[PDB]
Structure formats: C-alpha cells, structure tokens
TrEMBL record, chain A:
Keywords: Nucleotide-binding, Oxidoreductase. InterPro entries: NAD(P)-bd_dom_sf, Pteridine_reductase, Sc_DH/Rdtase_CS, SDR_fam. It comes from the Eukaryota. NADPH binds at R12, I13, H33, N34, S35, D60, L61, T62, N91, S93, Y153, K157, S186, L187. One of its GO terms (molecular function) is pteridine reductase activity. Belongs to the short-chain dehydrogenases/reductases (SDR) family. NADP(+) binds at residues 11-13, 33-35, 60-62, 91, 93, 153, 157, 184, 186-187. The keyword DNA-binding does not apply. The modification Cysteine sulfenic acid (-SOH) is found at C57, C71, C147. CDD domains: PR_SDR_c (cd05357). Pfam families: adh_short_C2. It comes from Trypanosoma brucei brucei. The active site is at D140, Y153. This is Pteridine reductase.
From TrEMBL, chains B, C:
The lineage of its organism: Eukaryota, Discoba, Euglenozoa, Kinetoplastea, Metakinetoplastina. GO terms for molecular function: nucleotide binding; pteridine reductase activity. The gene is PTR1. This is Pteridine reductase. It comes from Trypanosoma brucei brucei. The keyword Magnesium does not apply. Pfam families: adh_short_C2 (PF13561).
Length: 247, 248, 248, 249
C-alpha cells in the first residue's frame, strides 16, 4: 500500500483529503499544528477501518531557522511508519489580512512559510528520499483577483504556483509529478460571518454554493491516480466558475 | 437508463480513444466523423458488439459555412434520435496545418476556425437548447501561448475555444451544464509528421520524453465528465507532461 | 519623410483618438470606416487642415466573407497608394453585441469573428506581405477571462485576437515587425446607455471609479509604436484601472 | 519642484539605467545599493554634476530578517530626508542563483531570494504608501516565470510572489492614487559571471533581433509606466522580452 503525507489534515479540506486517500487504499500521515485532538480522532477512525494505516505528526510550518528540519521530519515520519512516501499534499495554510496601510515579520513568516516555504522544503525532503509518485499543492483559484488587503497571503499562493511549476519541471526526471488544486470558495473560514458567507456563495455560478471539502478532495484523488500519469505542472480549478465572474 | 455522449472526430486517434473510454464507462456514443467513414463504422460495430444499440455514426463537415449551424444542430439531433438524450458533448474534431503570414485563405479560415471554434460554439448552442450530470469537454492545446511557427489560424481557433469554454461555463452554469477543457501538449503525433520531427518533439517532454497516449488524454476527459468533477466548470486541464513549462 | 499608419474603425470613439494621436506624433493616417462616412471624412478634413495630404479615408466591411481577404489587401494598398509606405497597423474596428447560447447566427459569427479576429489576421498578412519601426497594435479586451454574460462570440473573437498577437509576434519578428496589444477594461460607454448604468460600471474600477478616456487608450498605442518600445513584441498592455483584478 | 524616486539596486546594470532615465526625465533619485558602494557613489556624483543635489545613495541589505521592515522604512525615509517627497518606487534589487531541490544554508537562500524579490518590495510598498499627483510603483518581474530556469525554484517563487504583490497592491492602493505595475524582462543584461558562448545561447533564442534587451530598453518601459501616458494603467505587467516567452521548447 502506498503512503501519503497530508499537511493540515485534522480538519476541513485536509481532513477530507486524508479520508479519501485512505479510502482509496493509502496509508496516511496526518500532520497538524494545534489540532492534536482532531488529528488523533481522525487517525483513530482510519485505524479502526484498517489497523496501523494512519499516524499523526505535529509541526509548526511557520518559517524559521528550524523549519527545514521540521519538514525533513514530517517526510521521515512517513518513512518510519510505512517504509515509503508516495504522495505529498501541501494543504496547511495560514489565511488572514495584512493591510498595506502580530508583527509584520511574524505575518511574513506565517503566511509565506505555510503557503510557500514549507511546501518548498517538504518538496525537497520528499524528492531527496526518492510507482506513482506525486505532489499536490492546494492553490487558490482567485489568485489573480485577490481579496482586498490579503497581499501576503496572495504572495504566498502565487509563490506556490511558482513552486508547482518549477518542481514539476525539475522533478519530472525522477518520475515525480507536481500539480495543484485551486479551490474558489469551499468550506468558509470558521471566523467569517454568516452574511459574508452567503455573499460569497451567491457569486458562484454553478449552484450558488461553496464546494464541499470532498469535492476538493476528488480533484486531489484524480491527480494522484493512475488516470493522471501524464499530468504534471497542472493546476485544476475546482471553483464552480467563480473565477470567471467579473466585478 | 444509460447516458449518451457526442464525440466529434471520433473515428480515429484521440477522439476514438475518448469514444471508447466513454463507452467503457457506460455511455452510449455518437461517433461523429467527416471523411473517415470506414473507421467510424468499424468503431461503432466494435462498440455495438459489446453492448447492442449503444453506438451510432454521424457524418458532418464542420468547416464554417452558412449551413454549419444546421449541421451542428443535426449532430445533436442525431444523439436524441438514437438515444433519447444527450448528456455529454466532446469537441474533439480539428483541422491542423500551417497558414504562414508571408487551399484559398478563405478555405483555411473556414476550416481552421470552423472546426476548432465555430463548430464547438454551434454544437454548444444546440446541446444547451435541447435539454443528471451534463457537461461539455473541449479539446484545447497546452501550447497555445507558445505556438508552433506559422500556425496562426490554428492558434487563433484554439484560443477562441478557450474563450468559448469560459464563456459557456459562465452562461450554462444555471442550467447545470459544466464546460471544461483538456489541453494536450504532444499526444499522437500527426500522421504527416516525419520521424525525426516526432523524435525532436518527444525529447522535449520532461515527464518521460514521450508523447501522451490517446488513452491518457481520454482519462482526463473521463474525469471531467464524471461525478468526481461536479463542481468543476471553466477549467482547462493540461495533459502535457510538463512540455508547456519548458523554455526555449 | 513621415511614417504612415492604418487605423481600422477610426471614425469615432477610440479609433478616432488613436488616429488623432498618431497624426499628432507625426504619422500620415488611413482612416478606415464602415458605416461612418461623414465622421471619417470630417476627421480627415481636420487632420489635413492641420497638415495637408496627411489623411485619407478607406471604406470597407470587415465582416468575414469570401471577399474579406481582398478587402483587407485593399486597405493596406490604400496606405501605400497614398503615402508610399505603411509602418503601423492598428486593428481597432470591432463588432460587439450579445449572442446568447440559449440577425442569423451565421451572420453573427461572420461579424463578431470577422471584425475581431479574421480581418486582423488578413490585414496582418497583407501588411507583412508588403514588407524603420514597423509594428501592429491589436485592440484587445482586459476582461476576456471574466467575460460579459452572453457575449460568447465576441469573447471568442477577442481570444482569437490574443492568439493572433502572439503568433504574429513570433512569426514576424525576423522582419522587425513587432505585434502587440492594448486591452481596455471600461473605456467609452455607449452614449445612449443611461448614466445610472454607466455608473454601475464606473464604480467597479479601482483607479478613480471612472472609465478610461479614448485618449488614455491611445496613449498606450502610441507607446507601443514608439522608439521606446522597440524590444516589445507579443505583449498586451492592460489599460483598465485595475478592473480585471476585482473579484465578483 | 521636481518629483523624487527610489530605485533599489541602482548602482549598476538595469537599476542604474532606470535611475539615469528617471533623472533625465527630471526626477531626483535615491540610489539604493547593498554591496556596490563605489558604483553607487560614482553614479550619484555623475547625476549631481548634471544637476546639483538631485541624487543621494542609500545602503541597505534587503535580505529578509526581523529588521527588514525598519530597513525598508528607512529607505523611504531617506527619500523624504533628501527631497521632501517620494513619488516613485522602483523595486529592482534582486538575488538570483539556483537552489536545486535534490542534492549557503537553505534558510539564508530563502531569506535572500524571497526577501529581495518579494518581501522587501512588499515592505517598501507599505512604507511608500504610509508616507503619502502621479504616484506609482514599478516592480521588476520576469517574463519567464511560467517557463522557469531549471533548479531556480526559490527565485521563481519570489518572482511569482512579486506578481501577486503587484496585483494586490494595485487593487489596495488605487484609492490612494498610487498605481502599481511591473516590467518583465526576458533576457536583458546577462550575468557578469556568464561566458560569451552561454550568453550567445540565450541571445539566439530571442525572435526579435536574436539579442538581449539593453538596459535602456528595460528602463524605457519603466519610464512609460511612471509617466502621465500611463495614468489609467495599474496592475499591469509589461513584458519587454523580444518575444522570448512565446518560443516553445
Ligand atoms: N476553504 C476555502 O474556501 C479555500 C479557498 C481557496 C484555497 N483554499 C486552500 O485550500 C487549503 C485548505 O483550506 P482550508 O480552508 O481547509 O484550510 P484552513 O482550515 O485555513 O487551514 C488548514 C490547516 O492549516 C494548518 N496550519 C495553519 N497554520 C499553520 C502553521 N503555522 N503551521 C502548520 N500548520 C498550519 C492548521 O492546522 P491545525 O488546525 O492543526 O493548527 C489548519 O487546520 C489551504 O491551502 C487553503 O489556502 C481554501
Ligand atoms: N495530437 C496531439 O498531439 C494534440 C496536441 C494538442 C491538441 N490536440 C487536440 O486534440 C484533439 C484530438 O487531436 P488529434 O490529433 O486526434 O486530431 P486529428 O487527428 O488532427 O483530427 C481529429 C479529427 O478531426 C476531424 N476533422 C478535421 N477536419 C474536419 C472537418 N472539416 N469537419 C469535421 N471534422 C473534421 C477528422 O475527422 P475524419 O478523419 O473523419 O475526417 C479527424 O480524424 C484536437 O482537437 C487537437 O487539436 C492534439
Ligand atoms: N469601449 C470600451 O470600453 C472597450 C472595452 C474593451 C475593449 N475595447 C476595444 O477597443 C476597440 C475600440 O472600442 P470602441 O468602443 O471605440 O469600438 P466601437 O465603437 O464598438 O467600434 C469601433 C468601430 O468598429 C467599426 N466596425 C464595427 N463593425 C464593423 C464591420 N462589420 N466592418 C468594419 N468595421 C466595423 C465601426 O465603424 P463604423 O462606425 O465606420 O461603421 C465602429 O465605429 C475595440 O476593438 C473594442 O473591442 C473597447
Ligand atoms: N538581467 C536580466 O536579463 C533580467 C531578466 C529577467 C528579470 N530581471 C530582473 O530585472 C531586475 C534587474 O536585473 P539585473 O540583472 O540588473 O539585476 P542584478 O544585477 O542581478 O541585481 C541588481 C542589484 O540587486 C542588488 N541586490 C542583490 N541582493 C541584494 C540584497 N541582499 N539586498 C539588497 N540589494 C540586493 C545588488 O546590489 P549591490 O550590487 O549594491 O549589492 C545588485 O546590484 C531584477 O529584479 C531582475 O530579477 C533581469
Ligand atoms: N488557509 C486558507 N486559505 C483560504 N483561502 N481560505 C481558508 N479558509 C479558512 C481559514 C479556514 N483557509
Ligand atoms: N487537430 C490537431 N491539432 C493538433 N494540435 N495536432 C493534431 N495532430 C495531427 C493532425 C493529426 N491535430
Ligand atoms: N468591448 C467593446 N468592444 C466594442 N467593439 N465596442 C464596445 N463598446 C462599448 C459598449 C460601448 N465595447
Ligand atoms: N536578479 C536577477 N534576476 C535575473 N533574472 N537575472 C539576473 N541577472 C543577474 C546578475 C546575474 N539577475
Ligand atoms: Na517542532
Ligand atoms: Na453611413
């Protein structure tokens, strides 16, 4: 059985991706930062289905002097548990506004670390340890029509597009594919107000609703599958047409 | 009962692989063709041997002309006539040849722009006008921003097809019709292409230094028409082995 | 001696402003028009009052048809007959109206795809064939990836024009002919559009909550044809006040 | 009074060309530099001999660190100290070197490549805006970001982030009348460290003249963007690449 690492997998979209990978037959490493209880509850659920097929792994993915070592250890955790690491899903992400007009350098470390630098370091560590091997990066369908006052977040997501492309090119000779999935509106942020959630939903052409986490996870499953073996450097929007709607 | 799909230019090559994979997934298929009558009938016979009354052929020229709207309406009609429904449209048929800036040019326009862009638009119109998982898949080109030299009309047509994909995704979303694309890089090389040229293209592809099989292209089409793509509309999936990421 | 430019659809609105600014920069101009003869002639008279023998008009329908290649060749020829040279081509003329998926459709195709894409292609062919700072500027649309609802053929035509811009840039670079685009967002609105509707569009624009003047669009054209742009080819400059960056 | 501009990494090469062209257009200029003190001072001396008290130098490292926000604030402050205003910011400074995925610390490479190409532009943009006619920012991008050089992931990441900043900042700063645009070279001045045969390999790829862009050609697009001829243009990135990005593998 192949094995996958999913970052930020205790809740929401990460959780659904881990669940669907496990349902497909993968053993999974459930990475978490603060959500230890949820991470272990997910592992307990998956291990009840198939013993010793899910483990948890804690790490902060904020940029720092220790982030390279932390990312090496996440990949190492998959090898320790399962003896291989076939799939990496870069899902973990900080998301909050950073107006141009926490210290700003902490915001940099968190927003650019989680969205871009940790994915890069995890990609390095994944590759260095190297079958259907692939990486899937969780992008953002709205990167070119960004939310107001979210410059660092947007920078991080653009950087992640860059990594997707650069790593697809560089890792192709190792048979490692690198792709992305770009939600528009999926599970709305827990802190967003109801009326705000509804305003976003009403903008989506395809059903005037957000994507379920499972719909996002379906695109991840496709990209890691045998049915995507010639696909690398591609980013699949799963956005219900939202990015096509003008102001 | 079983859903039904129209695949244009389905007698050979990628369209044939798409038709076969849709049929294997459970669809009844309209095999559109232009000149390749014997291949189209042979494919229909193959599919009907597997499940009777699940494949028919439909002949049409998709060159632009004043009768092209009627021709595209008749392809969609032919699906309803055979199967009583039309769930999926795959716009695959395509003319591809150079048109240097420096057949008459009017014919070149009609063929390249008609097959790659206008016929998809008219088929899209007719599909939409006539009707649980409805979708359209347009065969695009991953290299449209790094185009082949002296292929301006072809490239224009494929860019127009991106525009149609996006515009139709937006407009047809309220009807539950998703509209997406699949963009090959190099897949089955042109029959006309010489061996050395084919080898030069193959050697450019990062992932495996080989072209895509027809089946690999069809796999992306199958995903986009499936239940696993129900929130996906207006997306174009490159299936190019990284080719478009390679600088000059 | 003075360079010469062809501007399509130059009688009114953005094309007129472009022709004026090119003339102010020192170009002789061919004012192409279709229906707006009186305005074309008035512009020519104004320009020739400023400097005699510097402006001529040229009538043609740019709808797609069997005669469009000849018509386009004639427009280019008119610049050579008048001025002895043709240094700049500005593809500005454009039909724009909705074509819902759900006039006959073949005429809509001819008009929308002809004016926005096929006539630019044929004009580009004829320009190149007759061939220093030579360049072509195509009037694109900054909103082509977030298009107006029910404008599929228009959007297809503008996408095709992006592809032409790219393809022609690549192919014509060895002749030193640069090919670029200018992409307005909201510029001149219909005069007859109610101000309340105009204001809905204006309020969308981040930079000043107003539409671009024709002259602001023309400024970008002037840059691209200038000596300050001699390494720029295949580039499309948005002149949109940030509109294309604004989400739904 | 004459307007004032800050050009990062302006001692040499493209940045100097931009500073020179802005100065010739009537701007007073802050010549930011990191290690090239001699070159920076030489340029300032030359510009002040054309017009007295119209150029100053400003030294800063633009590597990311917890003091980078203060350093960026101080570059903008230096423009106001010398000239009383700051109308234009050109984010030109850039680290550029490979970072292979498979095998000087990686954290240093992150701090340099992401800091110079993205974070310092962001912080300078914040400081520029907080301190405020024809105000604008021009970011030096890269026309090849979607067809990147092999083994340059962190550089490419940085330049993609800079695209994101250009767009985000154009949106957010539009109500302040600050336009934010980019200029994206393909091949311009080749690296000093490259041999002529390798330079020629790159030159031969360029459809328009089989040559790199001069520094002045890049600067010409910057000057257009800061000019009155670009007053409705924001969020736009102009490729100045001779068609290079249109050429397939
Ligand atoms: N939801 C949407 O509509 C949407 C739209 C566009 C893009 N996306 C992208 O899709 C992905 C999943 O979205 P989501 O909404 O499910 O994400 P989310 O709930 O915002 O974040 C996912 C997880 O990231 C982890 N994380 C955050 N900061 C971290 C840090 N410093 N170190 C390590 N891990 C950290 C958290 O793990 P712990 O809980 O364990 O601390 C969190 O549960 C993200 O990449 C997001 O950007 C989502
Ligand atoms: N192969 C590749 O590497 C590649 C690369 C990029 C994109 N694509 C796209 O993928 C699709 C499939 O590629 P392919 O190589 O399999 O295509 P293809 O063999 O060039 O053409 C497919 C079929 O199009 C039909 N067709 C051509 N002109 C027509 C006309 N005037 N009216 C009606 N039908 C017409 C032909 O049908 P008859 O034989 O019955 O006459 C032909 O067999 C095309 O859209 C192509 O542009 C392919
Ligand atoms: N206005 C905007 O906000 C906006 C936004 C985005 C892009 N653009 C682009 O900018 C350019 C100029 O826009 P505009 O608003 O000034 O254009 P416009 O007023 O819609 O049209 C310009 C001219 O095109 C000519 N034209 C139309 N159909 C033709 C045909 N069949 N044959 C020949 N010529 C034909 C007409 O010439 P006659 O009057 O002589 O018949 C007309 O005056 C266009 O390419 C447009 O798509 C404009
Ligand atoms: N040259 C090309 O072909 C090309 C192609 C694509 C994009 N571009 C972009 O165009 C811009 C100019 O290119 P270029 O070739 O002229 O650049 P460059 O010579 O590589 O670098 C410009 C300057 O950046 C400064 N810099 C580097 N690291 C720094 C740091 N840690 N802190 C502060 N400043 C630092 C250096 O200043 P000091 O010398 O004072 O240390 C250097 O002179 C860059 O943004 C580049 O990415 C250029
Ligand atoms: N990390 C990230 N990124 C986006 N775009 N949206 C969200 N959504 C909610 C914070 C949970 N999360
Ligand atoms: N229609 C089309 N389009 C492309 N890109 N390639 C091909 N390949 C060869 C004519 C079969 N055909
Ligand atoms: N995008 C576009 N294209 C043309 N040809 N004309 C127009 N006219 C504007 C609605 C007045 N807009
Ligand atoms: N900063 C930067 N960025 C690019 N692309 N090219 C260059 N040339 C560098 C001096 C070698 N520098
Ligand atoms: Na830790
Ligand atoms: Na008239």
């Amino acid at each position: 059985a192949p094995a996958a690492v999913v970052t930020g997998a205790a809740k929401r979209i990460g959780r659904a991706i881990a669940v669907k990978l496990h349902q497909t037959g993968y053993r999974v490493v459930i990475h978490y930062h603060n959500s230890a209880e949820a991470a272990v509850s997910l592992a307990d659920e998956l291990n009840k289905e198939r013993s010793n097929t899910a483990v948890v792994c804690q790490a902060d993915l904020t940029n720092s002097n220790v982030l390279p070592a932390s990312c090496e250890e996440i990949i190492n955790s998959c090898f320790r548990a399962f003896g291989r690491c076939d799939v990496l899903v870069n899902n973990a992400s900080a998301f909050y506004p950073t107006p141009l007009v926490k210290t700003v350098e902490t915001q940099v470390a968190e927003l650019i670390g989680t969205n871009a630098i940790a994915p890069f370091l995890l990609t390095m560590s994944f590759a260095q340890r190297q079958s259907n091997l692939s990486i899937v990066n969780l992008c953002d369908a709205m990167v070119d029509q960004p939310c107001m006052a979210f410059s660092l977040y947007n920078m991080g997501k653009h950087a992640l597009v860059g990594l997707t492309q650069s790593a697809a090119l560089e890792l192709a000779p190792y048979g490692i594919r690198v792709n992305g999935v770009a939600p528009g509106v999926s599970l709305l942020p827990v802190a967003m107000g109801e009326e705000e959630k509804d305003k976003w939903r009403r903008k989506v052409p395809l059903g005037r609703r957000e994507a379920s986490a499972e719909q996002i996870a379906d695109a991840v499953i496709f990209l890691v599958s045998g049915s995507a073996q010639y696909i690398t450097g591609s980013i699949i929007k799963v956005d219900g047409g939202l990015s096509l709607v003008h102001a």
